[PDB]
Amino acid sequence: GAPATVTEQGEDITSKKDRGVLKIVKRVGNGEETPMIGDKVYVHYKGKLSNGKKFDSSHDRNEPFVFSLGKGQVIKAWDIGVATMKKGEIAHLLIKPEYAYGSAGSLPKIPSNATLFFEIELLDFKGE
Numbered sequence: 079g080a081p082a083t084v085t086e087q088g089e090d091i092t093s094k095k096d097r098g099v100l101k102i103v104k105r106v107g108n109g110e111e112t113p114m115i116g117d118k119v120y121v122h123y124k125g126k127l128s129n130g131k132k133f134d135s136s137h138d139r140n141e142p143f144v145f146s147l148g149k150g151q152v153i154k155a156w157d158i159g160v161a162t163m164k165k166g167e168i169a170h171l172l173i174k175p176e177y178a179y180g181s182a183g184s185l186p187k188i189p190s191n192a193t194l195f196f197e198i199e200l201l202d203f204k205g206e
């Protein structure tokens with residue numbers, strides 16, 4: 079399925095090149111600009127434990143998910159990954175625990191050493 083396809087075909091967007099955050103662009107966006115640290119970012123997303131065991135979508139709450147980029151309001155993988163995206167882009171991310179919730183996890187939703195999968199649509203972003 080989609081997690082395995084990211085494993086096989088995704089780009090490693092980590093600085094360390096440790097395969098900690100792998101990306102596939104599923105729908106191309108527009109514009110020269112990508113978000114930068116500080117911007118208010120609007121997304122829709124579907125996320126799950128990569129083994130399908132738990133799911134979460136912004137659509138469940140009938141509203142976009144909003145955060146400030148590069149401020150650690152989200153897991154590291156989102157600060158890295160969303161910074162690569164264009165407005166209108168849909169991307170798949172597959173994320174090792176080091177760029178998510180680590181060995182501690184974040185129970186009850188996230189166990190120790192969990193790999194995460196997200197589909198993210200970047201709706202908009204605005205400068206601080």
Ligand SMILES: COc1cc2cc(c1OC)O[C@H](C)CCn1cc(nn1)CCCCOC(=O)[C@@H]1CCCCN1C(=O)[C@H]2C1CCCCC1
Pocket residue numbers: 123125126127132133134143151152153156184187188194
């Ligand atoms: C581990 O805790 C959670 C994980 C995830 C979602 C969580 C969450 O909180 C309980 O709640 C939803 C986003 C709704 C409430 N909320 C929380 C925050 N803003 N709104 C702020 C904190 C968000 C932390 O989440 C994240 O950094 C990532 C990336 C942004 C979307 C949500 N993220 C998650 O890790 C989900 C998780 C995905 C895998 C399946 C279980 C939920």
